[PDB]
A paper describes a structure:
Vibrio cholerae contains multiple copies of chemotaxis response regulator (VcCheY1–VcCheY4) whose functions are elusive yet. Autophosphorylated CheA then donates phosphate to the response regulator CheY. Phosphorylated CheY interacts with the flagellar motor protein FliM and influence the direction of flagellar rotation from counter clock wise (CCW) to clock wise (CW). As expected, both VcCheY3 and VcCheY4 possess (β/α)5 fold typical of the response regulators.
As expected, the overall structure of VcCheY3-Q97A is almost identical to that of VcCheY3 and the Mg2+ ion bound at the active site occupies the equivalent position to that of Mg2+ (or Ca2+) of VcCheY3. Interestingly, even in the absence of the hydrogen bond between T90 and Q97, the conformation and packing of W61, M88 and V106 are found to be unaltered with respect to the wild type VcCheY3. These observations, coupled with the quenching results, point to the fact that although the hydrophobic packing of W61, M88 and V106 is independent of the hydrogen bond between T90 and Q97 in free state, in the absence of the later interaction, reorientation of W61 and M88 occurs more smoothly upon phosphorylation. VcCheY3-Q97A and VcCheY3-Q97A/E100A, on the other hand, showed considerable quenching in the presence of acP, suggesting that in the absence of the hydrogen bond between T90 and Q97 (and also in absence of E100), conformational alteration of W61 may take place more easily and it can move toward the surface of the molecule. Km value, obtained by us, was the highest for VcCheY3 (6.4±0.45 mM) followed by VcCheY3-Q97A (2.3±0.4 mM) and VcCheY3-Q97A/E100A (2.0±0.2 mM) which are in accordance with our structural observations. The lower Km values of VcCheY3-Q97A and VcCheY3-Q97A/E100A are due to the loss of the coupling between T90 and Q97 which facilitates the movement of T90 toward the active site and stabilize the acyl phosphate.
Numbering used by the authors: 5 to 128
Write the structure that this text describes.
């Protein structure tokens, strides 16, 4: 796992964006940027050459599931591994996210410990 991989953190609650960001900082990943909704994350991915996406699942403008779909329908972006953040792991929403092509999921609140298992798991 390369620690200079360009990571996009997507979440509508800015405090959550900065917590995810410091957890990634504690793990060797410092190349992080932010977006507050999928509508604002999309143009960032579209032009920014990112390597990894961490997105919230429920956002007001465009949802986590709809950004993953747009990423997956975009020829240029379809190779992007996506980790989803969710308030509780309901079986039904996860299966849906799995079917939509997400790489993994993590339930909040979470720690740097969990985050890394999730990252290792995704990258295999
Ligand atoms: Mg949210």
């Amino acid at each position: 796992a390369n620690k200079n991989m360009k990571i996009l953190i997507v979440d509508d609650f800015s405090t959550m964006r900065r917590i995810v960001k410091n957890l990634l900082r504690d793990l060797g990943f410092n190349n992080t940027q932010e977006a507050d909704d999928g509508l604002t994350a999309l143009p960032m991915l579209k032009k920014g050459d990112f390597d990894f996406v961490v997105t919230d699942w429920n956002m007001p403008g465009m949802q986590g599931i709809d950004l993953l779909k747009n990423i997956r329908a975009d020829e240029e972006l379809k190779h992007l591994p996506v980790l989803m953040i969710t308030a509780e792991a309901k079986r039904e929403a996860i299966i849906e996210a799995a079917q939509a092509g997400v790489n993994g999921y993590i339930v909040k609140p979470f720690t740097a410990a969990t985050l890394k298992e999730k990252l290792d798991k995704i990258f295999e």
